[PDB]
Design a binder for this molecule. Structure first.
Ligand code: HQQ
Ligand code: CA
Ligand code: CA
Ligand code: CA
Ligand code: ZN
Ligand code: ZN
Length: 168
């Protein structure tokens, strides 16, 4: 696994998140379901807990946008960058942005929102890109022959427990 330069990480285990807006591609309840599941993948193997806010500034502000959207890294239309996220820290740090020029899905038919969100949350928690082809944090998108098979690799678990420890 890799961490970011200087190893920034949250200095607390109870984190907040806010879904600021929604992609047209799925029902809101599906987006909420995909986001909750992506957070739980990391909650289950650490002491971290995520609490949903509906207004104000959460630690992890999740939003969907296209092209230029208020940071130094514009999106780029369909394909290429799918989303991006910032390492732990205040303000824009920790936030996750999803390119709404992608087609977001709940399955294998497009760009799986759960999958990509799970990878971005890794970044929001302090993990960079792994060299392991089976890691969730490996930098190469691939959807899945059955999502029910999905499992964090040991490389992802060890990265995240190195920063935050195992569940108490
Ligand atoms: C290219 C890239 C990305 C995003 C989500 C991914 O989801 C995965 C990761 C591994 C396996 C299957 C899906 C993969 C790459 C990635 O490297 N980093 C990222 O933050 N956004 C991106 O678009
Ligand atoms: Ca894109
Ligand atoms: Ca933030
Ligand atoms: Ca879209
Ligand atoms: Zn952005
Ligand atoms: Zn990545």
């Amino acid at each position: 696994f890799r961490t970011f330069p200087g190893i920034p990480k949250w200095r607390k285990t109870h984190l907040t998140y806010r879904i600021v807006n929604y992609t047209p591609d799925l029902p809101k309840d599906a987006v909420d379901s995909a986001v909750e599941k992506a957070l739980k993948v990391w909650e289950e193997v650490t002491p971290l807990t995520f609490s949903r806010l509906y207004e104000g500034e959460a630690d992890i502000m999740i939003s969907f946008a296209v092209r230029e959207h208020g940071d130094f890294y514009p999106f780029d239309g369909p394909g290429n960058v799918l989303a991006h996220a910032y390492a732990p820290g205040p303000g824009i740090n920790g936030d996750a942005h999803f390119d709404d020029d992608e087609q977001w899905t709940k399955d294998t038919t497009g760009t799986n929102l759960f999958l990509v969100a799970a990878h971005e949350i890794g970044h929001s928690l302090g993990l960079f890109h792994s060299a392991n082809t089976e890691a969730l944090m490996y930098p190469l998108y691939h959807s899945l022959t059955d999502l029910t098979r999905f499992r964090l690799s040991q490389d992802d678990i060890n990265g995240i427990q190195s920063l935050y420890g195992p569940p108490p």
